[PDB]
Design a protein around this ligand. Structure first.
Ligand SMILES: CC(C)n1ncc2cnc(Nc3cc([C@@H]4CCNC4)nc(N4CCC(F)(F)C4)n3)cc21
Length: 290
């Protein structure tokens, strides 16, 4: 069973499907309207047929259903009907920051600062629940028509959670196992501070329209990160960005996770604590988009 609180009913009983927004491996996403309230929602639809593995989708719903924070996309339930699973969430009309910057070009430093503050608020909340997003990037940061910011797409987090559960189930007898082996099996080998690194990369992505080393073979990038002399990336254009932005990048991209600042600590950084960071900055961006 995918989730103990699934609605075993047709989502079209409650929603009018307005537009297919896209589709791919993850399934399809629709813009729909609540037939009673008139509110807009996003519906993510995925095939869910007998003997399919439910574990990843199970974990994705578990994450969404236990979040109640402005900067995490709101969850309105899931429907299982005729072997299709529909996950219902708050609608963000502008899509992702990647959808946006592919049209607008690079964001301003103030726009990036506001985005980073809102993402850090969401991350601090997730981490206080002992959740890890694990896929912070422009494509997974959504913007609604009011210029508000919501973290979404917990698919990678759910995949990891499901793999972690499978490796507990088949770990075997533990009595000869080294503690570090047990720790990797139960906890994964890293912690929530990976999200802070990913936010730093995302800030560069919003500034430059690509993450660092985007044109290097992915396996080479992985290898380079494991060398003892690996150097964190930087913003390319030194004069375009303030010292505060360069420092935000420096500290979020701290190589050692033992020394990398937490989300709460980062919320005190000059870049995201400065005045004038509000949704008007992103409404400006959406006006440029149109
Ligand atoms: C991550 C996804 C399942 N998700 N989760 C919650 C959520 C809330 N709102 C949206 N909103 C939007 C808006 C737009 C706008 C149309 C025109 N420009 C962007 N596109 C899209 N997507 C095109 C590609 C897709 F995967 F189908 C989605 N989603 C998507 C949402």
């Amino acid at each position: 069973v995918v989730d103990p609180d699934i609605f075993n009913r047709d989502p079209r009983d409650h929603y009018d499907l307005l537009q297919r927004l896209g589709g791919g491996t993850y399934g399809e996403v629709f813009k729909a309207r609540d037939k009673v309230s008139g509110d807009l929602v996003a519906l993510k639809m995925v095939k869910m047929e007998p003997d399919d593995d439910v574990s990843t989708l199970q974990k994705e719903i578990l994450i969404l259903k236990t979040c109640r924070h402005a900067n995490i996309v709101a969850y309105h339930g899931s429907y299982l009907w005729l072997q299709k699973l529909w996950i219902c969430m708050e609608f963000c009309g502008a899509g992702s920051l990647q959808d946006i910057y592919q049209v607008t070009g690079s964001l301003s430093e103030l726009q990036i600062s506001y985005v980073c503050r809102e993402v850090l608020q969401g991350l601090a909340y997730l981490h206080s629940q002992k959740k890890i997003h694990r896929d912070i990037k422009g494509a997974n940061i959504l913007i609604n028509d009011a210029g508000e910011v919501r973290l979404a797409d917990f698919g990678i987090s759910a995949q990891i959670g499901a793999e972690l559960a499978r490796r507990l189930e088949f770990i075997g007898t533990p009595y000869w196992m080294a503690p570090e082996v047990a720790a990797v099996a139960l906890k994964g080998g890293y912690n929530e501070l990976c999200d802070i690194w990913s936010l730093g990369i995302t800030a560069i992505e919003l500034a430059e329209l690509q993450p660092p080393l985007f044109d290097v073979h992915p396996l080479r990038v992985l290898f380079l990160m494991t060398k003892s002399g690996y150097q964190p990336p930087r913003l390319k254009e030194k004069g375009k960005w303030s010292a505060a932005f360069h420092n935000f990048i420096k500290v979020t991209l701290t190589k050692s996770p033992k020394k990398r600042p937490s989300a709460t600590k980062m919320l005190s950084h000059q870049l995201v604590s400065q005045p004038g960071l509000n949704r008007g900055l992103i409404l400006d961006l959406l006006d440029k988009l149109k």
